[PDB]
């Protein structure tokens, strides 16, 4: 996250970090005690992934961290990386042992399709992650967060040479300086509804992070709500 602020501990208790050969290569969100939702491009190879819930400062031990191994990866049935690595960019991770829910490890709410789309239409969401804090710069140590406004589709299409399908949305600022970045992919875009946060997007991709005229591209969660509920039911 570029142009964000340090989260306080437990401020985004649904946030998880994915660790592999590199740490904090992607983010994720807690669906329930056994399931994480992330981007499909984060987990497209069959590599071992470590999920850490209750994380705050990725280079300090703080007591609240719960580490789990991923036993099953479910990319969306319409995901096809050979065709497009960033279309239907959503996956579910099944954990080896359930998380212990507490004030630092809490799921994100997921509304039905209609309400997930109404919540996105409020026009302002929070994104969070341990991604880069400058374009081509270092990753964050402390979890970062940022409020991002929804960007209209036409402005969004005019900003990039790549295709933006209707299952994606753009968010960010016309002047640049504030955006998600590499390492934040797979993390949550959430909308606060009278003090309860609902998952409205998955952080997906972009080009020059926070460059004036560019925006962050996100997967619309509303399209996948039924599939998430079906696959993650305990």
């Amino acid at each position: 996250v570029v142009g964000g602020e340090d989260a306080k501990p437990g401020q985004f208790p649904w946030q998880v970090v994915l660790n592999g050969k590199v740490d904090a290569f992607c983010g994720g969100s807690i669906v329930n005690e056994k399931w994480i939702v992330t981007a499909a491009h984060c987990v497209e190879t069959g590599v071992k992934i470590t999920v850490v819930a209750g994380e705050h400062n990725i280079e300090e031990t703080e007591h609240t961290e719960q580490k789990r191994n991923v036993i099953r990866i479910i990319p969306h049935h319409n995901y096809n990386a050979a065709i497009n690595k960033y279309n239907h960019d959503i996956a579910l991770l099944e954990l080896d042992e359930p998380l212990v829910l507490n004030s630092y490890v809490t799921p994100i709410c997921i509304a039905d399709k209609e309400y997930t789309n109404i919540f996105l239409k409020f026009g302002s969401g929070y994104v969070s992650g341990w991604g880069r804090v400058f374009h081509k710069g270092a990753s964050a140590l402390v979890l970062q967060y940022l409020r991002v406004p929804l960007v209209d589709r036409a402005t969004c299409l005019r900003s990039t040479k790549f295709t933006i399908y209707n299952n994606m949305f753009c968010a960010g600022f016309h002047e640049g300086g504030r955006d998600s970045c590499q390492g934040d992919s797979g993390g949550p875009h959430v909308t606060e509804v009278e003090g309860t946060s609902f998952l409205t997007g998955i952080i997906s991709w972009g080009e020059e992070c926070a460059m004036k005229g560019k925006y962050g591209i996100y997967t619309k969660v509303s399209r996948y709500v039924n599939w998430i509920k079906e696959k993650t039911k305990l």
Partner: protein
């Protein structure tokens, strides 16, 4: 009183019902409150809630 106007005054979800009334509802782990609009926690750690002191 309809779900198009201020979400029927429902905190989370609204459904239009008979005689120009609405029925509010909540996501998993919440209970519809006695005031018929608000959503109260029904489990120890309900989704989407910040419970750690932010002070």
């Amino acid at each position: 009183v309809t779900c198009n106007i201020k979400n029927g005054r429902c905190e989370q979800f609204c459904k239009n019902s008979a005689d120009n009334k609405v029925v509010c509802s909540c996501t998993e782990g919440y209970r519809l409150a006695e005031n018929q609009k608000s959503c109260e926690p029904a489990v120890p750690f309900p989704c989407g809630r910040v419970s750690v002191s932010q002070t």
